[PDB]
Structures are given as structure tokens and as C-alpha cells.
Amino acid sequence: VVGGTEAQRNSWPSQISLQYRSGSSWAHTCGGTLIRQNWVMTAAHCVDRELTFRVVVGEHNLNQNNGTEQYVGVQKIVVHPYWNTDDVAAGYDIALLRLAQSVTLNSYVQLGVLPRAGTILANNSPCYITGWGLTRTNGQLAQTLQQAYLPTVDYAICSSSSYWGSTVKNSMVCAGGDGVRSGCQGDSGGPLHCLVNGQYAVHGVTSFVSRLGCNVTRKPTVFTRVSAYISWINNVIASN
Ligand code: NA
């Protein structure tokens, strides 16, 4: 997250760190959201590589023991069947991961609440992106979980020529684009939290940014719109 601030350690208890085994150690690769005690939602492009993955819940500092972490292996990966890895802009950038064990809920570990199907945010709606991704274009991952305030940019604007044009689809949500704050590498897969009727819900899964840099004016971060996939999610969980 570029232009973020450190999150309080109990602010975003559905956030997870997806990590891969890197020799003797593990390394953060992307974010996700806990949506059942044994299921995680993330971006399809995060699990494109044939790596060994684990999920960490209750994480705050990637480089220190917080006393709150639970570590759990990934048993099954279900990627959206229309996902195509060389066309991120076609959409369907969403995957569900079934965990080997169910995690225990507490003030650091909670299920993400999803929006009702079909729900679309009005332009300029207040939202936060959270994650451990790079803190600057071509920079290094954050140590501690970061948050940034990114108001939504509606489809009519985002899909206009000086923004994203045809690369943004109605199955996506855009937010930010002020040139100071944005998503960045390592934030993929993680949540966009938006406050609606008094309650934060996860409306977006972080999908892509501009190749010209993370925080570029009129290139808002693009998220998979979770409210377009509620039936899909429910069908997967019920059939596995
Ligand atoms: Na830690």
C-alpha cells in the first residue's frame, strides 16, 4: 500500500497473509480475506504459480512475533473457471482457498462480511485498502499492516478514456487515482473495505494497477467486485 498508515492491530481481523515456502523460510506474496473458518478469498493471479502456500491469520508484523498468529496450510485451490492468466482485464480475478484446518475466531481473527449480491458503490464512497504490499513503486514490502483511504471511482468515470477506458469492466470496482495513495505489488488479493450503513464490508479483491506505477493519477487501483460473485462463492463452498 502506497501512502498508507499503520493499521491498529485489531482493525481488520479478516485480513490474511498468503505466503509461499522459499527455501527454509516463508515469504508473503499476497493478501486475502477469511470468509469461513476454513475458506479464504483471494485473487486468481496470486495462485497462478505452482508454489506451496500457507495462510497466516491474526498477523500484524511480518517480521516479528505478535503473539496472535495462526498458521494453516492450503488444502484446495478453486480458481474461477473463466479466469485467464494472460488477460487480467477480462476479469474473473478471484479464487477460493480451502484451509487444512479451521481457524479459531477472536478479536484478531474474524470472518469478512460480504456485500449483498448486485450492490454497487456510489461514486466517491469511503473505502480502505489494507495490506503488506510495497510502500513505494519498485520499493519493499511493509513490515506492519498498512491501510490507505481510497474513495471509489464509479464505472462511468473509470471507464472513460483518460482513466482506464475499456480495460475496466462492470465486474470491477475502482478506487483511488489521486496519485498519492494506492495499492501496490503484494497487496493483490487483499480487501477493499467500504463502510455502508454503518458496517465495513469487503467489496473488492485487489486485482491490478498501472504498469506506469502504483500511484499514478487517473489510474485508480482496480478490484474484482465481490458483489458480482456471491452466487459463485456460495456454490463453491456448498459443493466442497
Ligand atoms: Na508476526
From Swiss-Prot:
What Pfam families is this protein classified in?
Trypsin
Spans traversing the lipid bilayer: none
Residues binding Ca(2+), per UniProt: 59, 61, 64, 69
Start and end of every Peptidase S1 domain? 1-238
The EC code for this enzyme is 3.4.21.36
Cellular localisation: Secreted
The record's remark on the cofactor is: Binds 1 Ca(2+) ion per subunit.
What chemistry does it catalyse, as a reaction equation? Hydrolysis of proteins, including elastin. Preferential cleavage: Ala-|-Xaa
Provide a Gene Ontology MF annotation, just one. Answer: metal ion binding
Q: Which cofactor does it need?
A: Ca(2+)
| Function description | Serine proteases that hydrolyze many proteins in addition to elastin.
Name this protein carries in UniProt: Chymotrypsin-like elastase family member 1
Q: Which gene encodes it?
A: CELA1
